[PDB]
Amino acid sequence: TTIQVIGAGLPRTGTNSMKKALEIIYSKPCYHMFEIIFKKQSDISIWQQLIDETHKTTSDKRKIYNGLNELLNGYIATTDLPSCSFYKELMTMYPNAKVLLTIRDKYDWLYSLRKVVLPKSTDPWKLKIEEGDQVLGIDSNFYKMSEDSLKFAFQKNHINLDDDEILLECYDEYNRLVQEIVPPERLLIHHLGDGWESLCQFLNVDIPNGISYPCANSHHQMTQLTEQLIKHKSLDDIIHMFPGLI
Ligand SMILES: Nc1ncnc2c1ncn2[C@@H]1O[C@H](COP(=O)(O)O)[C@@H](OP(=O)(O)O)[C@H]1O
Ligand SMILES: CC(C)NC[C@@H]1CCc2cc(CO)c([N+](=O)[O-])cc2N1
């Protein structure tokens, strides 16, 4: 088992649906932030170490390659933060792996990002997200790793995360650089709604017979999850309300 597909798309661009789609195609696990949050919170400090390594004057690329290889052992693919921020390193480690860039309208993306992943620090909803996350054992260590991974993706040290104009241009910039760095024959750009056919051709497989392309992880559902985590204080007690999410 080795990485076949490197997902370079940013959070809220359909990465969880792509994760599920790749697991359907290959019948092997794909990495995603949900793997960290719901299955392996122990990985948070490992990711934090790697991102930190990138902030050294002279970063040790072999330390990073080895960390990545450790983290992704047994996975056939990667999507979402924090792995997407390392797509260049992943490309080097796995020269035969193809690259996917999931993408969507930037304004739709920002609204989705604000409601689920990166609320403004002035948003009361941020406190609700944090309360719900405590139920899952998710705390400041997680938030620091995820924010750091985003800043690493965007290649910014000091950045005002609360500024929508900065995020919007960072988003466009990120997507543009992926297209300029990855050779076109090694890259598929997948827009929301594109479904199986460009993906499957790209990966040299048939369209899965009678299996629909996944449509997962909407902001409405994530808002509901937060609301129910706060209300019932137990993931196990509410997971029947969220089929196919985790
Ligand atoms: N097959 C599909 N078609 C359209 N939108 C999809 C989709 N799969 C996922 N999405 C959208 O992708 C976003 C989540 O992406 P990610 O998994 O990276 O967090 C959500 O957007 P919204 O929050 O606007 O509803 C979700 O609704
Ligand atoms: C469990 C949920 C109710 N609260 C956790 C939230 C939503 C899921 C999530 C997903 C990502 C990337 O998909 C990131 N991220 O990259 O910062 C952060 C978070 N945080």
PDB file of C-alpha atoms in Angstrom, residues 110-131 161-164 223 226:
ATOM      1  CA  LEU A 110     -15.185  31.461   2.085  1.00  0.00           C
ATOM      2  CA  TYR A 111     -18.691  31.338   3.520  1.00  0.00           C
ATOM      3  CA  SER A 112     -18.326  27.591   3.975  1.00  0.00           C
ATOM      4  CA  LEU A 113     -14.877  28.017   5.566  1.00  0.00           C
ATOM      5  CA  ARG A 114     -16.154  30.686   7.993  1.00  0.00           C
ATOM      6  CA  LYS A 115     -19.124  28.582   9.074  1.00  0.00           C
ATOM      7  CA  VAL A 116     -17.199  25.341   9.682  1.00  0.00           C
ATOM      8  CA  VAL A 117     -13.426  25.654   9.803  1.00  0.00           C
ATOM      9  CA  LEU A 118     -12.177  29.189  10.387  1.00  0.00           C
ATOM     10  CA  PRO A 119     -14.732  31.545  11.927  1.00  0.00           C
ATOM     11  CA  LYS A 120     -13.624  35.135  12.561  1.00  0.00           C
ATOM     12  CA  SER A 121     -12.356  35.566  16.130  1.00  0.00           C
ATOM     13  CA  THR A 122     -15.227  38.052  16.560  1.00  0.00           C
ATOM     14  CA  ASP A 123     -17.846  35.450  15.671  1.00  0.00           C
ATOM     15  CA  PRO A 124     -19.903  34.082  18.602  1.00  0.00           C
ATOM     16  CA  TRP A 125     -20.234  30.870  16.566  1.00  0.00           C
ATOM     17  CA  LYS A 126     -16.540  30.199  17.215  1.00  0.00           C
ATOM     18  CA  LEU A 127     -17.368  29.626  20.876  1.00  0.00           C
ATOM     19  CA  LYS A 128     -20.065  27.140  19.883  1.00  0.00           C
ATOM     20  CA  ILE A 129     -17.692  25.229  17.608  1.00  0.00           C
ATOM     21  CA  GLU A 130     -15.192  25.094  20.476  1.00  0.00           C
ATOM     22  CA  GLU A 131     -17.829  23.854  22.946  1.00  0.00           C
ATOM     23  CA  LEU A 161      -6.993  35.380   9.346  1.00  0.00           C
ATOM     24  CA  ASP A 162      -9.998  37.597  10.118  1.00  0.00           C
ATOM     25  CA  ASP A 163      -9.673  39.503   6.819  1.00  0.00           C
ATOM     26  CA  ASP A 164     -11.912  38.045   4.101  1.00  0.00           C
ATOM     27  CA  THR A 223     -23.723  23.116  12.029  1.00  0.00           C
ATOM     28  CA  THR A 226     -22.030  21.113  16.575  1.00  0.00           C
TER      29      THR A 226
END
